[PDB]
Structure formats: C-alpha cells, structure tokens
C-alpha cells in the first residue's frame, strides 16, 4: 500500500541479488582457476616424467 | 512506483545472470588455456633436458 | 545419508549440485567398492561392532554368508561367540556393551534369515539361550534387535 | 517479522493488498517469479513436492501400521490453537522428517511383521498343544512309535467332523474310527487304521477338513513332543509379549508427530505450490506478492480466507458485497413460516455448548451442516419463538385471522423490498443512474395498496372495506382511470390512480434512456433485459411473499388440531387414568409435534431460495448463505 516499502524492498532485493551474483561469479572464477591449475599440473607432471 | 521495481528487478536479475555467464565464460577460458600451459611447458622442459644431455 | 538426502534437494548454481552429485558417487563408490568379507572379518576379529551404511544391507551378508563357512560355520560361531562372550564377561546395562550387542544381534538376524542352517551353529554355540536374555533387560533398541533375531530363530525353529 | 508469500492474478492486487494490509500486513510489494534470482522455479521444487508426497505416503503407511485411523483433517491457519500447535510458524526441513520417519516406518513394519509371525506361530502352537495332549492322552506308548497306525487331527466342531466321517465312510467304507473330543474352540479327533495304509489315509486327509496329519507337531526330537511344544509355546508368548510391548512403547510416543508432520508437509506443499515449483504454474499465476508480518498479526491474518490468494507463509470482497443483509433478512423472513419456536430455541441452544465437541465429532449428516450454520439456526430459532408464540391478534377460525395475516406479509415484505431497492440504489458509487428511476411503479402500486391496507384496519366507522380492503383497491386500480374509490378510500380521490398510472407509464421509457446518459460524464439488450427482469421481479417478489401466512396457518392448524384434540382427552378421566392417558397422549403428541416442527423448519427454505434468487438481483447464488455464517465468525 505504501510507496516507500516497495522501493526499500526492491532496493534490498536488488542489492542482495547483485551481491549473490557477484559472489557466485567469484566462486565460479575460483573453481575454474583451480580446475585449470590442476588440469595443467597433471599434464605437466606426466610430460615432466616422460621427458625425465 | 509499484510497477517500476519489477522492471528494474528484471534488468538487475538479467545483469546478474550475465555477470554469472561472464564468470562461466572466463572459467571456460581458463579451462581452455590450462592445457595450453602444460603443452607450452613440456616443450620448455625437453629443451632443458637436452642441455643436461648435451652437457654430459 | 546426509549427502544422499541433501543430493535430492537442489537449488540454483547447478554446478555445485553436479559437484555434490559427483562427490556422492565417489563417496559411496569409494567405500562400497571394498570387500565386505574382509571388512566383516577384520571387524569381527577386531572385537568392535558399529553401525554403518554397508553393515545393515542384506547384500553384504548374502555374499559373506557362503564365504563365512570355512569350518562348521566358524564365522557365525565366532561372531556369536563374541556376542555371547561380551554378555558373559563385560556385564550388560552399559553403554559400551549395548552397541556391540545390538550390532551383533542385528547382524545375526540377516544371517539367520538368509541361511536356515545357522540354527544348528547358534544352538550348538549357545547364542540361542543368550539371545533371549537380552530382550528382558534395557536397551530397547538392542532388545528390539534381539527380538528380531529371536523372531528369526523362532521362525525357523517352528513353522 | 515473519516472511509471508501470496500468489494471485494481476487484476485484484489492490483489493487483496488492501484486505491483507488491513489485517496487519506491512511492506507489501508486488513482484513476479522471473524478476528474482534466489526464489526461481526449477526441478528442485518438483523433487521437493515428490519428497513431500513420499513423506505423506510414509506418514500414511506409519499411520496404517500404527493401527490408528487416518487423519483426514487439516489446519494450516495460525488463527486457531490447533493450527499453531500442529504447524509452527518457523521453517521446516523435509529431509529431517523423512530421515526421522524412515527408521520409524521400517522399525514399525518389521515389528508388525515379527509380531504377526510370532502371533501366527503362537496361535499355531497353542492350537496344536491341546490336540497334541489329547492325542497323546488316548508318557508315550503308541504315539511316537511306528508299529501302530495313529491319525491325529484338529477340527472346528463335531458338526464339521460328521461330514468328514460321512466322506471318509463314503470314500473308504467302514475302515476307520469316528471319535470326537472337546477342546479349549477346537475339536480333538482320532482315527485308527492299518500301518500300511498311512499314505491313503494321509492323502484322503489332505482333501479333507482342517490340517491334521499322523504327527501333528513341529518338534518331535524329544519324548514326548508336548514338553518341547510347551517350551516353544512358552517362549513364543514371551517373544510376542516383548514385541507387543516394544510396539506399544514405540507407537505411544509418535501419535501426534504424524499429524503435525503431515500438517507441516501440507503447509510446505502449499508453500511449494504458491512458489510455482511446476512448469504449468508459470502461465496461470504470474503475480507473487511478499511482505513482513509481525508476531502479533499472524493470528489475525487467518481470520479471513482471502479472495484468491493463499495465505500460507514460511465472492472475495473485503467489506461489501457478500450477503450481509441475508443474516437479518434471512432469519427474520425464514422465522415467520413457523410456541413452536421454544423447542428450536432449546435444540439450537444445546448446539452452543455442543459446538466445541460437536465441531470435531461429525455426528450425522444434518448435524454437520446444522453445526456449520449454528449462528443462523440460533438466530432463526430464537426469532421463531416470537412468530410461533404469536400465532398459537388471535387464531380462532378461518376468514378472521387471514384478513390481517394476508396484509401482514405484504406490509412486512414492502419494507424489505424498499430496503432492498434503497440498498441497491445506494451502491454502485459520475457512475450514477439506472437505479433512481426504478422502484417507482411498484412503490406507487404497493404504496397505495399498503396505505389503503393500513388505513383499512383503522376505518371503523363505516368508511372502510370488508372486501378486503387493500386487495380490492389495488385490484380495481390499473383498470379504470376515471374511478372514485373501491373501496374505503380517502377524500382525494381519483388523482391517486392517475398519478400512479402516469408515474408508472413513464418509468418504462425513462429506465433505458438514463443508462447511456449517466455513463458519459451492449447496453441496449442489457437495458431491456434489466427492465423486463425488474418488471418480472417486481411482481414476483410481492407474489412470492405470500407463502408466510400459508405455512404458518398450516403448521399452526396442524399443531393446534392435535393439541386441541389431545388436551381435552388428556384432561378427562381424573386419577391414574388422567396421568397415564395424559402422559401417553402428551408423549405421542409432542413426539409427532417435534417431527412436524422439524419438518416445517426443513421445509422453510423458500425464504432462502426466494431471497437468494430474487433478492440477490435487486441488492447486488449461495455466497450470501456462506457469508452470513462467515460474517459472525470474523
């Protein structure tokens, strides 16, 4: 009924959605960096053993 | 401003979805370059082994 | 069990749900891939009975029922001798004896139900008279397991 | 403080938001399901609904295995104490209920199967114990050997054993023994034959009655088998007693948890259905509202069911119109058809005290609908005592009370018709018109008939009328314009019919013409349909309102005939004959009088049908009958 409650709830919902999207993007970037690091480390270890 | 918060919240949710899709594309790019790192490291290790063989 | 119950409920970020689904198959497949006969023989030889996910299934006792017979059913006579030996020495109405007594009494019901020849080794070893004494005491969960083993022995003792 | 979520279409968000906000709701913001990222629909809601259905099936299996009846009632509202005690306002988890109920369901199923198998084995050993003792009686000398041919058997009675002896004598001749022994019920039978005919006697006993063989027992390792059968029958009673004690002790602690978990799973299923967890609910309901409810307005939020929103957190008008005039016009006009109202006031007064236990008892089919409409039966039953005691001026004969009872229903219905026209004219609030012109011809005809009816009963001396007046005044009017009076008219005297016909004739064209003019600040067929419907309902209301004197005269004549034909016969023959004949006559008189009053009260639905059909058109279905009982509750 009031006009301030829709703006306050929409601003809090938008800020919480933006923070959740930023945290999910940071977690996805960290998981992709860790998976790329292990995926490089395995083939680097195998190629280093074969070259050794 | 009752009908404006859903219109702004839809654009904010689409911006959050594109922000998640950009991080997924960056994770796919790092997963693509992860094999290129070791494939670029093996050719740098074989030349290091060849100097240790030619020195002996 | 918490990973199996948590694997059903899903939400957003389905990559974490695929990570939990990959972790649940590696967690259940890592422990379930072991031998049930070696784990049951090491657990019965160690004198420590505890409830586990693969210890309450009929498939583990079904494959270990034929392999347990080495000399007159020495595996079931050793488990019943450990369960009755825990009742003789190490007196009951305690917290420590009720776990091994309830685990051995609950584990004896599957071997007694799957194999009808365990009544001769159980009656010859003496677990039939000791199994009836556990129902009158406390530990009504272990008394319910002893009522299940006594009901399984009573079902094969008379039809 | 508490999170509330509602769903409805985007056409009544202002009316549902005003009614929901008017009961304590604050911070109401209308949104959708695609504008958020933490409460979006997915397959996890369908898997949670399937887990809630598996938890409901596990609760139904635990309730069926518990030996208690299935709970068919549900209370998810926070207004009542049972809905708050069976459903807490805090959040819940389905995994804790399913994981806390799976072990109880498996343990209850294993305890039920072990108790049934132990009861069947104890019943078999106890049924075979007396047969083994009776067969062993007739130590052991010829009951455990092999040199004597003995045949034992259990039977129901000697009558069933006579057919077995007739079949054994018809299929084997006179080569057997017919004996019967009484047991504890069972029957001890014993047969004798050769040692080499045990195969024919056993095979003939196989197609015979109840299962008895040459050795009726499960243990024969000891001599005799009665000691081992007594030991197994003595251990099976202890195992069945321990299984029954563990089943009763385990089942005694989980009685209310199945109903509370079923109500919490029903509220979680309603929250999942309100959350749009399916794929076909994203095109039907697209409006989802949220708000903050405190810890003191949650009980007040369950006082109204809402128009179309499901008030479940973690004719739906708010104030009008819902049939508010039916609570006064319904019981007052319905009570006039019937002191006969004293028994309805006593039986309706018993339902006030019996409302609590009778609301959860569900005794009978008419007592359920009578208990739901207890306020309408209390108000109509209390109002029936006045009209019932007023009838039986005074009623002495026919042609005397009908002159006042005839105009009494028209004079009483005229105020209800004028109030029903003023109530519809006051509503619909720039947007005026089509209501001020109506109710002018019926107000003039019924006003001139009610004025001559009220003036007719005051006219003594001669300036009055016996035929009727009132009925002959409106009946003679509208036929002749140049009249004077027929009959009992005041010194006016011909301008009333000319003004009534002139004001009634102008009401036809002014009705449909005022509809398009008032809208300008499809109506052609609506104007003629509304004019013909108003012209039909105007005579239909006054024509239908005359049943009150007929029903009251019929019930009052049917009660006064038996009372007047029973009191005089009961009062005569003094002594013990007056007490026995007066008690036996008054008991059968009051017994048929209560059934006649209940028959008239059941047959008094013509005021509800006419008020629901004809009264609903000029005022604004079964919405007013439910709104009258729901009005006193909220």
Curated annotation (Swiss-Prot), chain A:
Disulfide bonds: none annotated. Residues 1-13 are annotated as: Interaction with VMA5. It is found in: Vacuole membrane. Residues 8-38 form a coiled coil. Residues 12-31 are annotated as: Interaction with VMA10. Changing residue 2 to A: Increases ATPase activity 1.4-fold. It comes from the Eukaryota. Homodimer. V-ATPase is a heteromultimeric enzyme composed of a peripheral catalytic V1 complex (components A to H) attached to an integral membrane V0 proton pore complex (components: a, c, c', c'', d, e, f and VOA1). Interacts with VMA5; the interaction is direct. Interacts with VMA10; the interaction is direct. Interacts with RAV1 and RAV2 components of the RAVE complex, which are essential for the stability and assembly of V-ATPase. Subunit of the V1 complex of vacuolar(H+)-ATPase (V-ATPase), a multisubunit enzyme composed of a peripheral complex (V1) that hydrolyzes ATP and a membrane integral complex (V0) that translocates protons. V-ATPase is responsible for acidifying and maintaining the pH of intracellular compartments. Present with 16134 molecules/cell in log phase SD medium. Belongs to the V-ATPase E subunit family. This is V-type proton ATPase subunit E. It comes from Saccharomyces cerevisiae (strain ATCC 204508 / S288c) (Baker's yeast).
UniProtKB/Swiss-Prot annotation, chain B:
The modification N-acetylserine is found at residue 1. It is found in: Vacuole membrane. Coiled coil: none annotated. Belongs to the V-ATPase G subunit family. Present with 2280 molecules/cell in log phase SD medium. Subunit of the V1 complex of vacuolar(H+)-ATPase (V-ATPase), a multisubunit enzyme composed of a peripheral complex (V1) that hydrolyzes ATP and a membrane integral complex (V0) that translocates protons. V-ATPase is responsible for acidifying and maintaining the pH of intracellular compartments. V-ATPase is a heteromultimeric enzyme composed of a peripheral catalytic V1 complex (components A to H) attached to an integral membrane V0 proton pore complex (components: a, c, c', c'', d, e, f and VOA1). This is V-type proton ATPase subunit G. The gene is VMA10.
UniProtKB/Swiss-Prot annotation, chain C:
It comes from the Eukaryota. It is found in: Vacuole membrane. Disruption phenotype: Increases the ATPase activity of membrane-detached V-ATPase V1. Abolishes growth at pH 7.5 and in the presence of calcium chloride, abrogates growth at pH 5.0. Present with 22500 molecules/cell in log phase SD medium. Belongs to the V-ATPase H subunit family. Subunit of the V1 complex of vacuolar(H+)-ATPase (V-ATPase), a multisubunit enzyme composed of a peripheral complex (V1) that hydrolyzes ATP and a membrane integral complex (V0) that translocates protons. V-ATPase is responsible for acidifying and maintaining the pH of intracellular compartments. This subunit is essential for activity, but not assembly, of the enzyme complex. This subunit is also required for silencing the ATPase activity of V-ATPase when V1 is detached from V0. V-ATPase is a heteromultimeric enzyme composed of a peripheral catalytic V1 complex (components A to H) attached to an integral membrane V0 proton pore complex (components: a, c, c', c'', d, e, f and VOA1). Interacts with YND1. This is V-type proton ATPase subunit H. It comes from Saccharomyces cerevisiae (strain ATCC 204508 / S288c). The gene is VMA13. The chain holds residues 320 to 478 of 478 of the full protein.
From Swiss-Prot, chain D:
Residues 457-499, 557-577 are vacuolar. Glycosylated. It comes from the Eukaryota. Residues 104-132 form a coiled coil. Its main location: membrane. It is a multi-pass membrane protein. The chain crosses the membrane at residues 320-338, 339-354, 369-392, 404-423, 436-456, 500-519, 532-556, 578-616. InterPro entries: V-ATPase_116kDa_su, V-type_ATPase_116kDa_su_euka. Changing residue 601 to A/D/H/Q: Abolishes ATPase activity and proton transport, but does not affect complex assembly. Keywords: Acetylation, Coiled coil, Glycoprotein, Hydrogen ion transport, Ion transport, Membrane, Transmembrane, Transmembrane helix, Transport, Vacuole. The keyword Membrane applies. GO terms for biological process: cellular hyperosmotic response; cellular response to alkaline pH; polyphosphate metabolic process; protein localization to vacuolar membrane; protein-containing complex assembly; proton transmembrane transport; vacuolar acidification. One of its GO terms (molecular function) is ATPase binding. Belongs to the V-ATPase 116 kDa subunit family. This is V-type proton ATPase subunit a, vacuolar isoform. It comes from Saccharomyces cerevisiae (strain ATCC 204508 / S288c) (Baker's yeast). The gene is VPH1.
């Amino acid at each position: 009924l009031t006009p301030n409650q829709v703006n306050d709830e929409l601003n809090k919902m938008q800020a919480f959605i933006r923070k959740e999207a930023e945290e999910k993007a940071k977690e996805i970037q960290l998981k992709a960096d860790q998976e790329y690091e292990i995926e490089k480390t395995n083939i680097v270890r195998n190629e280093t053993n074969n070259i050794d | 401003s009752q009908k404006n918060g859903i219109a702004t919240l839809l654009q904010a949710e689409k911006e959050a979805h594109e922000i998640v899709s950009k991080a997924r594309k960056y994770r796919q790019d790092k997963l693509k370059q992860a094999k290129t790192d070791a494939a670029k490291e093996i050719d740098s290790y074989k030349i290091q082994k060849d100097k240790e063989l030619k020195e002996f | 069990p918490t990973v199996q119950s948590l694997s059903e409920r899903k939400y957003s970020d389905e990559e974490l749900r695929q990570d939990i689904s990959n972790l649940k198959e590696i967690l259940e497949n890592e422990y379930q891939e072991l031998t049930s006969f070696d784990e049951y023989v090491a657990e019965l030889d160690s004198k420590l009975l505890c409830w586990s996910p693969p210890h309450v299934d009929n498939g583990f006792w079904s494959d270990n029922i034929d392999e347990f017979k080495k000399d007159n059913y020495k595996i079931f006579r050793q488990l019943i001798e450990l369960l009755q030996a825990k009742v003789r020495n190490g007196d009951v109405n305690a917290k420590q004896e009720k776990i091994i007594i309830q685990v051995a009494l609950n584990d004896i019901t599957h071997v007694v139900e799957l194999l009808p020849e365990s009544i001769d080794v159980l009656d010859k070893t003496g677990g039939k008279a000791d199994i009836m004494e556990l129902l009158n005491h406390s530990d009504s969960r272990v008394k319910y397991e002893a009522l299940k083993a006594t009901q399984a022995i009573i079902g094969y003792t008379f039809k | 403080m508490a999170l509330v979520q509602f769903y409805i279409p985007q056409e009544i968000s202002r009316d549902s938001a005003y009614t929901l906000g008017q009961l304590g709701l604050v911070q109401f913001r209308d949104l959708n399901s695609k504008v958020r990222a933490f409460q979006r629909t997915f397959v996890n809601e369908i898997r949670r609904l399937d887990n809630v259905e598996r938890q409901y099936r596990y609760f139904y299996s635990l309730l069926k295995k518990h030996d208690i009846k299935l709970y068919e009632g549900d209370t998810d509202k926070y207004l009542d104490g049972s809905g708050e005690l069976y459903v807490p306002p805090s959040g819940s988890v389905i995994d804790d209920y399913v994981r806390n109920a799976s072990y109880l369901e498996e343990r209850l199923i294993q305890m039920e199967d072990a108790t049934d198998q132990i009861e069947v084995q104890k019943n078999d050993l106890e049924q075979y114990r007396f047969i083994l003792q009776s067969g062993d009686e007739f130590n052991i000398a010829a009951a455990i050997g092999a040199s004597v041919n003995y045949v034992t058997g259990v039977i129901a009675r000697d009558k069933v054993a006579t057919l077995e002896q007739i079949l054994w004598r018809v299929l084997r001749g006179n080569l057997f023994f017919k004996t019967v022994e009484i047991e504890q019920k069972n029957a001890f039978i014993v047969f004798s034959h050769g040692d080499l005919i045990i195969k024919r006697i056993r095979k003939i006993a196989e197609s015979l009655d109840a299962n008895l063989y040459d050795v009726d027992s499960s243990n024969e390792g000891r001599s005799q088998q009665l000691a081992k059968v007594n030991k197994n029958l003595s251990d099976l009673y202890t195992v069945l007693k321990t299984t029954s004690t563990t089943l009763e002790s385990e089942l005694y602690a989980i009685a209310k948890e199945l109903d509370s978990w079923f109500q919490d799973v029903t509220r979680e299923k309603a929250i999942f259905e309100i959350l749009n967890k399916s794929n076909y609910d994203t095109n039907r309901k697209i409006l989802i509202a949220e708000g903050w409810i405190p810890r003191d307005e949650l009980a007040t939020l369950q006082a109204r069911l809402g128009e179309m929103i499901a008030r479940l957190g973690i004719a739906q008008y708010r104030e009008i119109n819902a049939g508010l005039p039916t609570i006064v016009t319904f019981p007052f006009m319905f009570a006039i058809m019937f002191g006969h109202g004293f028994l309805m006031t006593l039986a309706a007064l018993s339902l006030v005290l019996n409302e609590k236990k009778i609301n959860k008892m569900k005794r009978g089919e008419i007592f359920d609908m009578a208990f739901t409409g207890r306020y309408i039966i209390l108000l109509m039953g209390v109002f029936s005592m006045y009209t019932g005691f007023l009838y039986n001026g005074t009623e002495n004969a026919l042609l005397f009370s009908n002159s006042y009872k005839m105009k009494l229903s028209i004079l009483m219905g005229f105020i209800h018709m004028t109030y029903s026209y003023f109530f519809s004219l006051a509503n619909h609030l720039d947007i005026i018109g089509n209501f001020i012109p109506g109710l002018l011809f019926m107000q003039g005809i019924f006003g001139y008939l009610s004025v001559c009816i009220v003036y007719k009963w005051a006219v003594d001396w001669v300036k009055d009328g016996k035929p009727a007046p009132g009925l002959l005044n409106m009946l003679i009017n509208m036929f002749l314009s140049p009249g004077t009076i027929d009959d009992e008219l005041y010194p006016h005297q011909a301008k009333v019919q000319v003004f009534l016909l002139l004001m009634a004739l102008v009401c036809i064209p002014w009705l449909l013409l005022v509809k398009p003019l008032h809208f300008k600040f499809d109506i052609m067929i609506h104007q003629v349909i509304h004019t013909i419907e108003f012209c039909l309902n105007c005579v239909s209301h006054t024509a239908s309102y005359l049943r009150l004197w007929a029903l009251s005269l019929a019930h009052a004549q049917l009660s006064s005939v038996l009372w007047t034909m029973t009191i005089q016969i009961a009062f005569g023959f003094r002594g013990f004959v007056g007490v026995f004949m007066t008690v036996a006559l008054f008991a059968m008189w009051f017994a048929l009088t209560c059934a006649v009053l209940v028959l008239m009260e059941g047959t008094s639905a013509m005021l509800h049908s006419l008020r629901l059909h004809w009264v609903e058109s000029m005022s604004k279905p079964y919405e007013p009958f439910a709104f009258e009982y729901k009005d006193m509750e909220v």
